[PDB]
Amino acid sequence: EERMERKRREKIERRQQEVETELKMWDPHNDPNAQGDAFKTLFVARVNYDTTESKLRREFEV
Amino acid sequence: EDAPPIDLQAPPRYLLKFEQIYLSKPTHWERDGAPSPMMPNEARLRNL
């Protein structure tokens, strides 16, 4: 009853502590991959892995 | 651009001057209105 909660608390805290280290090292805004104005750029997810680059252009160029 | 600005007045007046154009790729709008790209093969088939 408690050993499970003890293990449940560490995995939550361990990640939370690991989160602070990543934010300090990596900068989201300062990303080489990211380019262009942020208000202009768009984000698309749940895209099929077989989607060719041209297929993604011709579908979002409309 | 070579067209003359249409100055109309009753007073208030309006010119309605055009400055630039933009021609996108061939597209098709269904009844729902979802803009989707239309391929030539789709046009020859759907008589579009």
Please list every residue in chain B followed by a chain break, i.e. its C lies more than 2.5 Å from the next written N.
Answer: 10
Q: What are the CB-based long-range contacts (under 8 Å, 24+) for B22-26?
A: B24/A61, B24/A62, B25/A58, B25/A61, B25/A62
Give the gap in angstroms from C-alpha A33 to the nearest C-alpha of chain B.
Answer: 27
Please give, rounded to a whole number of angstroms, the shortest distance from the CA of A57 to a CA of chain B.
Answer: 10
Chain B hits for A58, CB-CB cut-off 8 Å, are 25, 37
Structure token digits, residue B5: 């600005």
**Interior angle at CA A59, CA A32 and CA B21, nearest 5:** 90
